[PDB]
Amino acid sequence: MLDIPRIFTITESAHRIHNPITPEKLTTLGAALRLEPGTRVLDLGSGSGEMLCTWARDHGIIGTGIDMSQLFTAQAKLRAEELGVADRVTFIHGDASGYVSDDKAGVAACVGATWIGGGVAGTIELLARSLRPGGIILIGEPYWRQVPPTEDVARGCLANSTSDFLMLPELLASFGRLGYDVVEMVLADQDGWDRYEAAKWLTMRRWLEANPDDELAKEVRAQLTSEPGRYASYTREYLGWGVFALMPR
Ligand SMILES: Nc1ncnc2c1ncn2[C@@H]1O[C@H](CSCC[C@H](N)C(=O)O)[C@@H](O)[C@H]1O
Ligand SMILES: [Cl-]
């Protein structure tokens, strides 16, 4: 059955936002986009639906979120009900690879799942096919906050290689090379990374307590031990993250 690996489910079951941005930043982003009521938002890799739900509440948007996780999709639906916006935003459990909406969106988004389109360029291209005239593309993507000196530092940041990400100005320039204007941006800070990573540790510890005999208990235990050090040594110092608003030239 279509689903993400269990480790992700286990570590992120208590996350509203599956990315290194705070709720305050997500709100800021929504306001920065100057969205009129009834604007349609398509969100590929929509997580637990926080973006769609909170923006439906605060801006009166409508839309669709597609996510491969069975758990996070259920959570998205619950969230929509909790906030009184279940009639405004819909959540589909599915693979977003190659997903093109016939219903074109004023905002077409992929916030932190750019592998869906095979990377930044491919994801932008995919979202462009669902974009209504005059609309905005949202891309959430890491960047090098500082240049990692070695491949060991790149890998400690959970990148395959140093070339996986760009420095901020090089990333912005790459959007221009693809034929897009950068029209807005909200970047994570280290406190946002702290929210995203540190919350996993508590979730893991409680999960271990409640599931001592699970097959994954050993792997979760090992990760809980090493993650705080790895995070603070590598990710927190070297890895940036942001959401970039783009409009085709
Ligand atoms: N092929 C695919 N299609 C749809 N969702 C996918 C996917 N591959 C991974 N995902 C989902 O992409 C998400 C990456 S985390 C980012 C989620 C969301 N934008 C947020 O800010 O919270 C996970 O929820 C995972 O379930
Ligand atoms: Cl629209």
Q: Give me ligand 2 centre to Cα 73, in Å.
A: 23
Whether the CB-CB separation of 42 and 105 falls below 8 Å is answered with yes
Give the number of other Cβ atoms within 10 Å of residue 34's Cβ.
10
Torsion-angle region of 226 (φ positive above 0: left; ψ -120 to 50: alpha; else: beta): alpha
Q: In the chain, what is the straight-line distance between the N-terminal and C-terminal CA atoms, in Å?
A: 41
Q: How many CB atoms lie within 10 A of CB 142?
A: 23
20 lines ligand 1 (CB under 6 A): no
Which pair of structure tokens corresponds to residue 146? 């500082």
Q: For 3-49, give the secondary structure using H, E and C.
A: CCCHHHHHHHCCCCCCCCCCHHHHHHHHHHCCCCCCCEEEEECCCCC
- Our CA angle for 107, 243, 230, nearest 5°, is 145
Q: Specify the amino acid at residue 95.
A: D
171: Cα separation from own chain's centroid = 17
Q: Tokens for 100?
A: 């093109």
DSSP 111-132: ES-GGGGTSHHHHHHHHHTTEE
- How was this model experimentally determined? X-ray
Dist. CA 7 → ligand 1 center (Å): 14
**Six-digit token string for 21:** 């941005």
Ligand nearest to the CA of 136: 2
Residue range(s) defining the domain that contains residue 63: 2-249
Ligand 1, atom 11, lies closest to the CA of 45
Distances in whole angstroms, Cα of residue 129 to Cα of each of 48, 94, 185: 24, 19, 22
Q: What is the CATH number of the domain that holds 223?
A: 3.40.50.150
Contacts of 94 (CB under 8 A, 6+ apart): 2, 66, 67, 68
The rounded distance, in Å, linking the Cα atoms of 210 and 203 is 11
* Total domain count, the chain: 1
DSSP sequence for 153-212: HHHHTT-SSGGGS-BHHHHHHHHHHTTEEEEEEEE--HHHHHHHHHHHHHHHHHHHHH-T
Q: Which of 127, 162, 126 is nearest to 142 (CA)?
A: 162
Q: Length of the chain, please?
A: 249
Please count the CA atoms within 13 angstroms of the CA of 136 that sit on its side-chain side: 20
The DSSP bridge pattern shows strands 180-187 and 131-144 to be unpaired
Alpha-carbon distances of 67 from 64, 74, 220, rounded to whole Å: 10, 10, 24
At residue 74, the 3 state secondary structure works out as helix
Task: Please give the distance of CA 155 from its chain centroid, rounded to a whole number.
Answer: 20
